[PDB]
mmCIF file of N, CA and C in Angstrom:
data_model
loop_
_atom_site.group_PDB
_atom_site.id
_atom_site.type_symbol
_atom_site.label_atom_id
_atom_site.label_comp_id
_atom_site.label_asym_id
_atom_site.label_seq_id
_atom_site.Cartn_x
_atom_site.Cartn_y
_atom_site.Cartn_z
ATOM 1 N N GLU A 1 -115.364 -90.478 -37.981
ATOM 2 C CA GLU A 1 -115.001 -91.875 -38.169
ATOM 3 C C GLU A 1 -114.046 -92.410 -37.101
ATOM 4 N N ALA A 2 -113.396 -91.554 -36.314
ATOM 5 C CA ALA A 2 -112.494 -92.015 -35.262
ATOM 6 C C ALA A 2 -111.233 -92.635 -35.861
ATOM 7 N N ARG A 3 -110.814 -92.099 -36.991
ATOM 8 C CA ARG A 3 -109.586 -92.495 -37.634
ATOM 9 C C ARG A 3 -108.384 -91.893 -36.933
ATOM 10 N N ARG A 4 -107.283 -92.633 -36.938
ATOM 11 C CA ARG A 4 -106.030 -92.156 -36.366
ATOM 12 C C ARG A 4 -105.342 -91.232 -37.353
ATOM 13 N N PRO A 5 -105.144 -89.964 -37.019
ATOM 14 C CA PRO A 5 -104.638 -88.999 -37.995
ATOM 15 C C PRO A 5 -103.215 -89.329 -38.419
ATOM 16 N N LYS A 6 -102.841 -88.826 -39.597
ATOM 17 C CA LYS A 6 -101.515 -89.139 -40.125
ATOM 18 C C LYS A 6 -100.428 -88.467 -39.294
ATOM 19 N N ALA A 7 -100.507 -87.146 -39.136
ATOM 20 C CA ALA A 7 -99.541 -86.414 -38.319
ATOM 21 C C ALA A 7 -100.017 -86.480 -36.872
ATOM 22 N N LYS A 8 -99.814 -87.645 -36.260
ATOM 23 C CA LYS A 8 -100.406 -87.945 -34.961
ATOM 24 C C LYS A 8 -99.515 -87.444 -33.836
ATOM 25 N N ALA A 9 -100.129 -86.774 -32.865
ATOM 26 C CA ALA A 9 -99.457 -86.436 -31.627
ATOM 27 C C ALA A 9 -99.226 -87.692 -30.789
ATOM 28 N N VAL A 10 -98.314 -87.558 -29.832
ATOM 29 C CA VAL A 10 -97.899 -88.631 -28.942
ATOM 30 C C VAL A 10 -98.241 -88.202 -27.528
ATOM 31 N N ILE A 11 -99.074 -88.975 -26.853
ATOM 32 C CA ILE A 11 -99.583 -88.566 -25.556
ATOM 33 C C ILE A 11 -98.972 -89.457 -24.486
ATOM 34 N N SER A 12 -98.948 -88.950 -23.260
ATOM 35 C CA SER A 12 -98.371 -89.709 -22.160
ATOM 36 C C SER A 12 -99.349 -90.774 -21.690
ATOM 37 N N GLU A 13 -98.831 -91.963 -21.388
ATOM 38 C CA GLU A 13 -99.711 -93.056 -20.994
ATOM 39 C C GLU A 13 -100.114 -92.990 -19.526
ATOM 40 N N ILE A 14 -99.312 -92.334 -18.682
ATOM 41 C CA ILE A 14 -99.499 -92.326 -17.228
ATOM 42 C C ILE A 14 -99.149 -90.951 -16.664
ATOM 43 N N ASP A 15 -99.323 -90.811 -15.348
ATOM 44 C CA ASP A 15 -98.839 -89.652 -14.607
ATOM 45 C C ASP A 15 -97.335 -89.766 -14.379
ATOM 46 N N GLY A 16 -96.655 -88.622 -14.389
ATOM 47 C CA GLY A 16 -95.212 -88.606 -14.225
ATOM 48 C C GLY A 16 -94.681 -87.214 -14.489
ATOM 49 N N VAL A 17 -93.380 -87.139 -14.778
ATOM 50 C CA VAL A 17 -92.739 -85.869 -15.105
ATOM 51 C C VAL A 17 -91.614 -86.097 -16.108
ATOM 52 N N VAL A 18 -91.305 -85.050 -16.868
ATOM 53 C CA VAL A 18 -90.580 -85.177 -18.125
ATOM 54 C C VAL A 18 -89.093 -84.898 -17.931
ATOM 55 N N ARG A 19 -88.291 -85.384 -18.879
ATOM 56 C CA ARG A 19 -86.912 -84.934 -19.023
ATOM 57 C C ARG A 19 -86.466 -85.180 -20.456
ATOM 58 N N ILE A 20 -85.938 -84.131 -21.090
ATOM 59 C CA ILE A 20 -85.576 -84.195 -22.501
ATOM 60 C C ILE A 20 -84.194 -84.826 -22.656
ATOM 61 N N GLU A 21 -83.886 -85.248 -23.881
ATOM 62 C CA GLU A 21 -82.538 -85.731 -24.184
ATOM 63 C C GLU A 21 -82.330 -85.609 -25.693
ATOM 64 N N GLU A 22 -81.646 -84.542 -26.121
ATOM 65 C CA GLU A 22 -81.552 -84.194 -27.539
ATOM 66 C C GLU A 22 -80.115 -84.380 -28.024
ATOM 67 N N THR A 23 -79.846 -85.531 -28.629
ATOM 68 C CA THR A 23 -78.582 -85.792 -29.298
ATOM 69 C C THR A 23 -78.769 -85.689 -30.814
ATOM 70 N N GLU A 24 -77.646 -85.748 -31.539
ATOM 71 C CA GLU A 24 -77.650 -85.424 -32.964
ATOM 72 C C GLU A 24 -78.695 -86.243 -33.712
ATOM 73 N N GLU A 25 -78.522 -87.561 -33.750
ATOM 74 C CA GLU A 25 -79.406 -88.419 -34.528
ATOM 75 C C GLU A 25 -80.439 -89.137 -33.660
ATOM 76 N N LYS A 26 -80.840 -88.531 -32.543
ATOM 77 C CA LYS A 26 -82.004 -89.032 -31.821
ATOM 78 C C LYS A 26 -82.384 -88.037 -30.734
ATOM 79 N N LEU A 27 -83.693 -87.896 -30.517
ATOM 80 C CA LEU A 27 -84.257 -86.975 -29.528
ATOM 81 C C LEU A 27 -85.431 -87.702 -28.874
ATOM 82 N N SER A 28 -85.162 -88.347 -27.741
ATOM 83 C CA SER A 28 -86.153 -89.126 -27.012
ATOM 84 C C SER A 28 -86.561 -88.386 -25.743
ATOM 85 N N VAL A 29 -87.788 -88.642 -25.288
ATOM 86 C CA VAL A 29 -88.362 -87.965 -24.128
ATOM 87 C C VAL A 29 -88.951 -89.003 -23.182
ATOM 88 N N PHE A 30 -88.772 -88.776 -21.882
ATOM 89 C CA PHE A 30 -89.178 -89.712 -20.841
ATOM 90 C C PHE A 30 -90.164 -89.024 -19.909
ATOM 91 N N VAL A 31 -91.281 -89.687 -19.620
ATOM 92 C CA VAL A 31 -92.207 -89.236 -18.575
ATOM 93 C C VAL A 31 -91.975 -90.149 -17.374
ATOM 94 N N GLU A 32 -91.047 -89.748 -16.502
ATOM 95 C CA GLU A 32 -90.611 -90.599 -15.401
ATOM 96 C C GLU A 32 -91.578 -90.513 -14.222
ATOM 97 N N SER A 33 -91.888 -91.676 -13.646
ATOM 98 C CA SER A 33 -92.895 -91.815 -12.605
ATOM 99 C C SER A 33 -92.287 -92.360 -11.318
ATOM 100 N N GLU A 34 -92.987 -92.082 -10.210
ATOM 101 C CA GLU A 34 -92.548 -92.513 -8.887
ATOM 102 C C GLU A 34 -92.325 -94.015 -8.817
ATOM 103 N N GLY A 35 -92.896 -94.770 -9.759
ATOM 104 C CA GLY A 35 -92.504 -96.137 -10.035
ATOM 105 C C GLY A 35 -91.563 -96.152 -11.222
ATOM 106 N N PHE A 36 -91.957 -96.803 -12.310
ATOM 107 C CA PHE A 36 -91.132 -96.851 -13.511
ATOM 108 C C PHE A 36 -91.871 -96.173 -14.668
ATOM 109 N N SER A 37 -91.169 -95.989 -15.796
ATOM 110 C CA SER A 37 -91.667 -95.174 -16.904
ATOM 111 C C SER A 37 -91.266 -95.761 -18.259
ATOM 112 N N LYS A 38 -91.774 -95.121 -19.325
ATOM 113 C CA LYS A 38 -91.504 -95.472 -20.715
ATOM 114 C C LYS A 38 -90.870 -94.292 -21.453
ATOM 115 N N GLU A 39 -90.250 -94.618 -22.587
ATOM 116 C CA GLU A 39 -89.460 -93.708 -23.408
ATOM 117 C C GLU A 39 -90.181 -93.449 -24.727
ATOM 118 N N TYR A 40 -90.205 -92.188 -25.155
ATOM 119 C CA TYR A 40 -90.974 -91.781 -26.330
ATOM 120 C C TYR A 40 -90.028 -91.295 -27.425
ATOM 121 N N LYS A 41 -89.657 -92.209 -28.315
ATOM 122 C CA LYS A 41 -88.910 -91.828 -29.509
ATOM 123 C C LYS A 41 -89.748 -90.901 -30.391
ATOM 124 N N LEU A 42 -89.101 -89.911 -31.016
ATOM 125 C CA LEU A 42 -89.805 -89.082 -31.987
ATOM 126 C C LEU A 42 -88.807 -88.346 -32.871
ATOM 127 N N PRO A 43 -89.173 -88.050 -34.128
ATOM 128 C CA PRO A 43 -88.272 -87.301 -35.020
ATOM 129 C C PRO A 43 -87.940 -85.925 -34.467
ATOM 130 N N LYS A 44 -86.703 -85.490 -34.715
ATOM 131 C CA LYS A 44 -86.138 -84.410 -33.913
ATOM 132 C C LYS A 44 -86.935 -83.118 -34.052
ATOM 133 N N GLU A 45 -87.160 -82.653 -35.286
ATOM 134 C CA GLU A 45 -87.804 -81.345 -35.389
ATOM 135 C C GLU A 45 -89.263 -81.364 -34.945
ATOM 136 N N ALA A 46 -89.792 -82.518 -34.530
ATOM 137 C CA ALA A 46 -91.151 -82.571 -34.009
ATOM 138 C C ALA A 46 -91.277 -81.667 -32.791
ATOM 139 N N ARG A 47 -92.344 -80.869 -32.770
ATOM 140 C CA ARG A 47 -92.501 -79.789 -31.801
ATOM 141 C C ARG A 47 -93.106 -80.290 -30.492
ATOM 142 N N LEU A 48 -92.621 -79.746 -29.376
ATOM 143 C CA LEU A 48 -93.004 -80.207 -28.049
ATOM 144 C C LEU A 48 -93.974 -79.235 -27.390
ATOM 145 N N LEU A 49 -94.781 -79.774 -26.468
ATOM 146 C CA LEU A 49 -95.693 -78.998 -25.632
ATOM 147 C C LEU A 49 -95.380 -79.187 -24.153
ATOM 148 N N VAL A 50 -94.180 -79.668 -23.850
ATOM 149 C CA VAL A 50 -93.778 -80.041 -22.504
ATOM 150 C C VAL A 50 -92.455 -79.361 -22.188
ATOM 151 N N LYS A 51 -92.470 -78.454 -21.214
ATOM 152 C CA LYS A 51 -91.235 -77.909 -20.672
ATOM 153 C C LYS A 51 -90.589 -78.967 -19.779
ATOM 154 N N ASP A 52 -89.299 -79.234 -20.006
ATOM 155 C CA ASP A 52 -88.588 -80.276 -19.264
ATOM 156 C C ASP A 52 -88.870 -80.146 -17.769
ATOM 157 N N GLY A 53 -89.159 -81.279 -17.124
ATOM 158 C CA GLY A 53 -89.534 -81.292 -15.727
ATOM 159 C C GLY A 53 -91.000 -81.030 -15.449
ATOM 160 N N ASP A 54 -91.750 -80.492 -16.414
ATOM 161 C CA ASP A 54 -93.174 -80.265 -16.200
ATOM 162 C C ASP A 54 -93.873 -81.573 -15.823
ATOM 163 N N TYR A 55 -95.082 -81.433 -15.287
ATOM 164 C CA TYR A 55 -95.895 -82.544 -14.813
ATOM 165 C C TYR A 55 -97.105 -82.720 -15.725
ATOM 166 N N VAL A 56 -97.403 -83.981 -16.046
ATOM 167 C CA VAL A 56 -98.297 -84.353 -17.135
ATOM 168 C C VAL A 56 -99.385 -85.287 -16.615
ATOM 169 N N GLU A 57 -100.633 -85.000 -16.991
ATOM 170 C CA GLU A 57 -101.724 -85.954 -16.859
ATOM 171 C C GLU A 57 -101.499 -87.129 -17.821
ATOM 172 N N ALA A 58 -102.237 -88.219 -17.612
ATOM 173 C CA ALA A 58 -102.164 -89.357 -18.524
ATOM 174 C C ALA A 58 -103.046 -89.102 -19.748
ATOM 175 N N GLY A 59 -102.436 -89.057 -20.936
ATOM 176 C CA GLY A 59 -103.119 -88.634 -22.145
ATOM 177 C C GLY A 59 -102.929 -87.169 -22.502
ATOM 178 N N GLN A 60 -102.246 -86.409 -21.658
ATOM 179 C CA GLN A 60 -101.871 -85.045 -21.982
ATOM 180 C C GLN A 60 -100.883 -85.047 -23.144
ATOM 181 N N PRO A 61 -101.139 -84.298 -24.211
ATOM 182 C CA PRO A 61 -100.255 -84.375 -25.379
ATOM 183 C C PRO A 61 -98.883 -83.794 -25.083
ATOM 184 N N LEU A 62 -97.857 -84.469 -25.611
ATOM 185 C CA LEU A 62 -96.471 -84.025 -25.515
ATOM 186 C C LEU A 62 -95.997 -83.389 -26.817
ATOM 187 N N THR A 63 -96.060 -84.115 -27.932
ATOM 188 C CA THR A 63 -95.909 -83.415 -29.197
ATOM 189 C C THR A 63 -97.208 -82.693 -29.538
ATOM 190 N N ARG A 64 -97.154 -81.852 -30.550
ATOM 191 C CA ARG A 64 -98.370 -81.206 -30.995
ATOM 192 C C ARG A 64 -98.887 -81.901 -32.238
ATOM 193 N N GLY A 65 -100.197 -81.887 -32.386
ATOM 194 C CA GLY A 65 -100.844 -82.495 -33.530
ATOM 195 C C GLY A 65 -102.234 -82.962 -33.152
ATOM 196 N N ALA A 66 -102.818 -83.769 -34.036
ATOM 197 C CA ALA A 66 -104.075 -84.386 -33.667
ATOM 198 C C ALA A 66 -103.812 -85.533 -32.697
ATOM 199 N N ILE A 67 -104.831 -85.876 -31.918
ATOM 200 C CA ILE A 67 -104.732 -86.913 -30.897
ATOM 201 C C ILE A 67 -105.539 -88.117 -31.362
ATOM 202 N N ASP A 68 -104.882 -89.244 -31.491
ATOM 203 C CA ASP A 68 -105.581 -90.470 -31.845
ATOM 204 C C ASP A 68 -106.615 -90.723 -30.755
ATOM 205 N N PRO A 69 -107.911 -90.628 -31.045
ATOM 206 C CA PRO A 69 -108.892 -90.757 -29.950
ATOM 207 C C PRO A 69 -108.737 -92.039 -29.152
ATOM 208 N N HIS A 70 -108.455 -93.156 -29.823
ATOM 209 C CA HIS A 70 -108.299 -94.437 -29.142
ATOM 210 C C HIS A 70 -107.164 -94.406 -28.133
ATOM 211 N N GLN A 71 -105.965 -94.005 -28.571
ATOM 212 C CA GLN A 71 -104.885 -93.770 -27.620
ATOM 213 C C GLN A 71 -105.373 -92.918 -26.459
ATOM 214 N N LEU A 72 -106.189 -91.912 -26.757
ATOM 215 C CA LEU A 72 -106.749 -91.092 -25.698
ATOM 216 C C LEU A 72 -107.725 -91.883 -24.839
ATOM 217 N N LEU A 73 -108.560 -92.720 -25.458
ATOM 218 C CA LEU A 73 -109.628 -93.370 -24.702
ATOM 219 C C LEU A 73 -109.076 -94.370 -23.698
ATOM 220 N N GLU A 74 -108.027 -95.115 -24.066
ATOM 221 C CA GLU A 74 -107.471 -96.084 -23.121
ATOM 222 C C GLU A 74 -106.798 -95.357 -21.971
ATOM 223 N N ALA A 75 -106.088 -94.274 -22.295
ATOM 224 C CA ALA A 75 -105.343 -93.517 -21.299
ATOM 225 C C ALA A 75 -106.271 -92.748 -20.359
ATOM 226 N N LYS A 76 -107.232 -91.984 -20.905
ATOM 227 C CA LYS A 76 -107.974 -91.042 -20.081
ATOM 228 C C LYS A 76 -109.453 -91.366 -19.889
ATOM 229 N N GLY A 77 -110.054 -92.204 -20.728
ATOM 230 C CA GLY A 77 -111.405 -92.666 -20.475
ATOM 231 C C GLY A 77 -112.496 -92.083 -21.362
ATOM 232 N N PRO A 78 -113.731 -92.586 -21.195
ATOM 233 C CA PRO A 78 -114.839 -92.136 -22.046
ATOM 234 C C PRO A 78 -115.088 -90.631 -22.020
ATOM 235 N N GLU A 79 -115.363 -90.071 -20.848
ATOM 236 C CA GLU A 79 -115.660 -88.646 -20.791
ATOM 237 C C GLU A 79 -114.556 -87.835 -21.450
ATOM 238 N N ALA A 80 -113.309 -88.255 -21.258
ATOM 239 C CA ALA A 80 -112.197 -87.505 -21.818
ATOM 240 C C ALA A 80 -112.280 -87.451 -23.333
ATOM 241 N N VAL A 81 -112.466 -88.601 -23.982
ATOM 242 C CA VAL A 81 -112.526 -88.600 -25.444
ATOM 243 C C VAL A 81 -113.832 -87.962 -25.921
ATOM 244 N N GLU A 82 -114.952 -88.275 -25.256
ATOM 245 C CA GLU A 82 -116.196 -87.555 -25.529
ATOM 246 C C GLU A 82 -115.952 -86.051 -25.596
ATOM 247 N N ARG A 83 -115.224 -85.493 -24.627
ATOM 248 C CA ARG A 83 -114.827 -84.080 -24.691
ATOM 249 C C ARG A 83 -114.063 -83.768 -25.980
ATOM 250 N N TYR A 84 -112.859 -84.316 -26.131
ATOM 251 C CA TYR A 84 -112.027 -84.077 -27.309
ATOM 252 C C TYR A 84 -112.829 -84.036 -28.600
ATOM 253 N N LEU A 85 -113.650 -85.066 -28.819
ATOM 254 C CA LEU A 85 -114.351 -85.190 -30.090
ATOM 255 C C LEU A 85 -115.293 -84.017 -30.314
ATOM 256 N N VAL A 86 -116.144 -83.722 -29.326
ATOM 257 C CA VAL A 86 -117.048 -82.583 -29.437
ATOM 258 C C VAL A 86 -116.267 -81.310 -29.758
ATOM 259 N N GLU A 87 -115.258 -80.992 -28.943
ATOM 260 C CA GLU A 87 -114.544 -79.743 -29.154
ATOM 261 C C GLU A 87 -113.862 -79.734 -30.512
ATOM 262 N N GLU A 88 -113.103 -80.790 -30.807
ATOM 263 C CA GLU A 88 -112.313 -80.840 -32.029
ATOM 264 C C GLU A 88 -113.178 -80.684 -33.275
ATOM 265 N N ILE A 89 -114.438 -81.129 -33.210
ATOM 266 C CA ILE A 89 -115.369 -80.970 -34.320
ATOM 267 C C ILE A 89 -115.876 -79.542 -34.408
ATOM 268 N N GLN A 90 -116.182 -78.920 -33.260
ATOM 269 C CA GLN A 90 -116.683 -77.540 -33.263
ATOM 270 C C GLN A 90 -115.671 -76.580 -33.851
ATOM 271 N N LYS A 91 -114.413 -76.737 -33.471
ATOM 272 C CA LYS A 91 -113.334 -75.929 -34.008
ATOM 273 C C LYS A 91 -113.474 -75.786 -35.523
ATOM 274 N N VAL A 92 -113.769 -76.878 -36.229
ATOM 275 C CA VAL A 92 -113.901 -76.794 -37.685
ATOM 276 C C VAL A 92 -115.047 -75.859 -38.064
ATOM 277 N N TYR A 93 -116.197 -75.998 -37.392
ATOM 278 C CA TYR A 93 -117.410 -75.305 -37.834
ATOM 279 C C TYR A 93 -117.337 -73.816 -37.516
ATOM 280 N N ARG A 94 -117.004 -73.493 -36.275
ATOM 281 C CA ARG A 94 -116.659 -72.162 -35.831
ATOM 282 C C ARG A 94 -115.817 -71.445 -36.876
ATOM 283 N N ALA A 95 -114.794 -72.119 -37.406
ATOM 284 C CA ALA A 95 -113.858 -71.451 -38.302
ATOM 285 C C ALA A 95 -114.483 -71.079 -39.631
ATOM 286 N N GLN A 96 -115.629 -71.641 -39.980
ATOM 287 C CA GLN A 96 -116.369 -71.155 -41.133
ATOM 288 C C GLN A 96 -117.539 -70.299 -40.707
ATOM 289 N N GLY A 97 -117.591 -69.913 -39.445
ATOM 290 C CA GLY A 97 -118.706 -69.147 -38.939
ATOM 291 C C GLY A 97 -119.983 -69.948 -38.994
#
């Protein structure tokens, strides 16, 4: 159905590189670019897939979870989401043999 999952991962909108900032009542992450960048608020214990300073494709997931295909489609394009969907569906079937 292409529904946006409840426990949704947060993906990077552009190319850039990361830097963490973990204070008590907020933990925001920035994918800084050779031009300008955006800031990604998220709840603190949310798990990361980005080592600080690492380099990220556009649509590469930063938190872990399901990926809203639409967020993916605008960022990375048709073939990219076409990929995700096929694989993400097979994972389910494989797991029941």
